[PDB]
Amino acid sequence: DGKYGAQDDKGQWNGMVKELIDHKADLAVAPLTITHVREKAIDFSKPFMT
Amino acid sequence: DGKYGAQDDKGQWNGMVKELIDHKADLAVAPLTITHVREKAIDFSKPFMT
Amino acid sequence: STTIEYITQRNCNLTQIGGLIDSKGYGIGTPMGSPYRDKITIAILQLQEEG
Amino acid sequence: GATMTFFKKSKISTFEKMWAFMSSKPSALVKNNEEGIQRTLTADYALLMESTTIEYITQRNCNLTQIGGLIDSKGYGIGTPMGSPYRDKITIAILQLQEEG
């Protein structure tokens, strides 16, 4: 999607989050924010930085 | 025992780690420096402060 | 902060002021119940420790 | 302390160099925070320690200033016993708490 990942109108994901949920990707690598909704949708490792 | 918890030179842990390892404390909200040495012993949470 | 830092450092006409009024984390997203995220966190910690 | 452990574990030439310099002189060493507090209050003797501790001390001391930002990277989390479900719930709670400001 060219985005870090955004919730759709029905709460649907896209980009990294959707691919991880669909397991079409194994690692999500981007300067994407770690939000509580995103953490629930997909797990996160320790951040490189805050 | 007042300490951040660390890996001793005998191969044994102390402090919060053992308290979490021995399952006498199910949670420990405290200043806890996050290191991969202490990560292996006990997984931390998301850093509430950096 | 890092974006504006890159912008200012790659030009000679932009002033950067302030670097922290809030804080958000940027790490590696992993699927639900990831077993391989633990070693990822350990390696991230090791890289931070070694600088 | 965490700072000196970081310095010995760091691979940055500046950090290891400054650590070697300070460790070289036994008169530039302290074993307790208040020792360095008193030394600084007595004469120019800079103390490097957890930034939260430095900020708290400065907020509690009108004779000591704060200089330098978050030079290094550390953080404080919540320890989780191996094989526990509390980690994800704790993470979502703290993430939403910090998200709200």
Curated annotation (Swiss-Prot), chain C:
It comes from the Eukaryota. Glycans are attached at N13. Expressed in the olfactory bulb (at protein level). Expressed in the deep cortical layers, dentate gyrus, reticular thalamic nucleus, mammillary bodies, pons, and cerebellum of the adult. Mass spectrometry data suggest the protein is N-glycosylated at five distinct sites. It is found in: Cell membrane; Postsynaptic cell membrane. Belongs to the glutamate-gated ion channel (TC 1.A.10.1) family. GRIK3 subfamily. Homotetramer, and heterotetramer with GRIK4 or GRIK5. Can form functional heteromeric receptors with GRIK2. Interacts with PRKCABP. Interacts with NETO2. Ionotropic glutamate receptor that functions as a cation-permeable ligand-gated ion channel, gated by L-glutamate and the glutamatergic agonist kainic acid. Binding of the excitatory neurotransmitter L-glutamate induces a conformation change, leading to the opening of the cation channel, and thereby converts the chemical signal to an electrical impulse. The receptor then desensitizes rapidly and enters a transient inactive state, characterized by the presence of bound agonist. The postsynaptic actions of Glu are mediated by a variety of receptors that are named according to their selective agonists. This receptor binds domoate > kainate >> L-glutamate = quisqualate >> AMPA = NMDA. This is Glutamate receptor ionotropic, kainate 3. It comes from Rattus norvegicus (Rat).
